């Protein structure tokens, strides 16, 4: 999960030589779908990513309090002063073939939280198993190999 309700499972895991990369060699930790941002109108994920990028460059942790006078323009000016693009885009390259990506990718650090719903605690299979004492039907629960 993000810090903005942007939860989601891992689709797939790529190694580094497949997964795309910027001109500075920074391969991202995690690729998220663009379409999740504007349908939910989650703008604070984008501003958090920009502020975290500026914080990582400048070495000072960023203030993200709600009702301060901190705007996207000031963070954009700071990121421009640190030598990157003002809105956070980086020109990255395809990992499989090395060709440049035609569209520029929003990129940067963002605080993510791992949630307790591991897949290993949720997978379930049963061909035959213990039946209930009452109705001769398969039992309740994945710990008891139920139906």
């Amino acid at each position: 999960a993000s810090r903005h309700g942007q939860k989601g499972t891992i689709g797939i895991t790529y190694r580094r030589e497949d997964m795309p990369f910027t001109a500075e060699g920074i391969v991202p930790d995690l690729i998220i779908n663009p379409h999740a941002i504007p349908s939910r109108m989650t703008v604070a994920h984008l501003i958090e990513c920009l502020l975290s990028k500026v914080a990582a460059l400048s070495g000072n942790e960023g203030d993200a309090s709600p009702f301060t006078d901190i705007t996207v323009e000031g963070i954009s000016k700071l990121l421009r002063e640190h030598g990157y693009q003002s809105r956070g885009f980086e020109v990255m390259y395809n990992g499989h073939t090395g060709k440049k990506l035609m569209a520029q990718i929003f990129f940067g650090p963002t605080y993510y939280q791992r949630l307790r719903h591991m897949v290993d605690d949720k997978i379930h299979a049963r061909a035959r198993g213990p039946m209930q004492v009452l109705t001769r039907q398969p039992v309740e629960g994945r710990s008891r190999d139920g139906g």
Partner: protein, 391 residues
């Protein structure tokens, strides 16, 4: 499993990880998104049962839904987005990419399509490459507003002899809508050919968007200086009109509409004025954003988002409503203890004039929280009531 399109017979492909994996097109009838959702699998135990499951409940046999005689499945999400950027006028594909895009189709007829750009450089257009996924003998004709046999906006859609003539491919062509490519193919050629069409188009568009790239960012949700200036002027003139209406009903010279009292007419006029203010500001914001803007590309593709999402993310959130009215007076004659008594101004009864990217004031943040709580409680009660009604 509220409807029969969510009990469907698939074919097993054994994969070496711990998740059920399934095609992205069938996530619309399943009402499924991979935010932690689980699904169940049932194995038949006899030849009769397996045979009727494969011949009745199979995935290709249920592309058209008997609910509303339109295809319940469709090219959705980013494969809907990439197919808009593949078949634009601007998009031309070089030889080293054309050969891989042709090889990704399993039922490719094996002949290289002649380029739409012969010389100075051999270039294929995106419509030509996508037409290989469409089988032959499929003919579709559709016109939007202001669409002719010449297409300056390049809207509409024309498919002749298994080839795309003109028109970008968007939600109106491959999406879950009647009169699209999916419905025509599954009613003229069969279910199996339409399933193969789903596979071929998803393979081609996913490979092209893989080697092309797509994103969205914070800069996609910001308008420039003058555009936000006239958006602020629109909000200011709406506040001026509301102040005028407040003075007119304050002078007791404002007439009451039929079937409603003075205050009901006052609230109705204020709500209509602020809603048209939000609509005008959002329309200006949508006009300002360019073709390299990605939210505009997504909304034009019909994959995700809407006009009102850009309106709230760029120009103005708008009026926040609780139980169909403005923010009620929970205190004595005022909404919050930070205003004076008897304040009927829009910002004191729940108008969020500041957009999301410009942040929210604490009062409008609390009002937006009240609106969100309205939405959550209404969603939960609606789901429970409609589940009981369905049963």
């Amino acid at each position: 499993s509220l409807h029969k399109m969510s009990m469907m017979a698939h074919r097993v492909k054994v994969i070496p990880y711990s998740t059920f994996r399934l095609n992205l097109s069938v996530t619309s009838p399943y009402n499924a998104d991979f935010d932690g959702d689980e699904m169940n699998l049932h194995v038949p135990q006899s030849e009769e049962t397996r045979a009727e499951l494969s011949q009745l409940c199979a995935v290709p046999l249920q592309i058209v839904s008997p609910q509303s005689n339109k295809p319940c499945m469709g090219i959705v999400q980013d494969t809907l987005c990439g197919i808009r950027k593949l078949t634009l006028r601007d998009t031309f594909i070089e030889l080293d990419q054309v050969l891989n895009m042709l090889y990704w189709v399993p039922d490719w007829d094996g002949v290289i399509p002649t380029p739409a750009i012969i010389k100075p450089k051999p270039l294929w257009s995106g419509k030509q490459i996508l037409s290989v996924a469409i089988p032959n003998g499929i003919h579709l004709q559709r016109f939007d507003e202001g669409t002719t046999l010449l297409s300056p906006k390049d809207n509409g859609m024309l498919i002749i002899d298994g080839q795309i003539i003109f028109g970008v491919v968007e939600k109106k062509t491959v999406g879950s809508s009647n009169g699209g490519l999916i419905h025509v193919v599954t009613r003229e050629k069969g279910p199996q050919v339409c399933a193969k069409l789903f596979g071929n188009i998803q393979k081609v568009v996913n490979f092209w968007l893989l080697h092309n790239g797509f994103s969205t960012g914070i800069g996609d949700t910001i308008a420039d200086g003058p555009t936000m200036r006239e958006i602020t002027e629109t909000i200011a003139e709406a506040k001026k009109k509301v102040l005028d209406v407040t003075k007119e009903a304050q002078a007791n010279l404002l007439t009451a509409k039929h079937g409603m009292t003075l205050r009901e007419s006052f609230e109705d006029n204020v709500v209509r004025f602020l809603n048209e203010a939000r609509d005008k500001a959002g329309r200006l914001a949508e006009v300002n954003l360019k073709d390299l803007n990605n939210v505009k590309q997504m909304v034009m593709a019909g994959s995700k988002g809407s006009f009102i999402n850009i309106a709230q993310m760029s120009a103005c959130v708008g009026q926040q409503s609780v139980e169909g009215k403005r923010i009620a007076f929970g205190f004595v004659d005022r909404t919050l203890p930070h205003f004076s008594k008897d304040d009927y101004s829009p910002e004191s009864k729940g108008f969020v004039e500041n957009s999301y990217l410009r942040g929210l004031t604490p009062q409008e943040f609390f009002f937006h929280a009240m609106g969100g709580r309205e939405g959550l409680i209404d969603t939960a009660v609606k789901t429970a009531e409609t589940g009981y009604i369905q049963r």
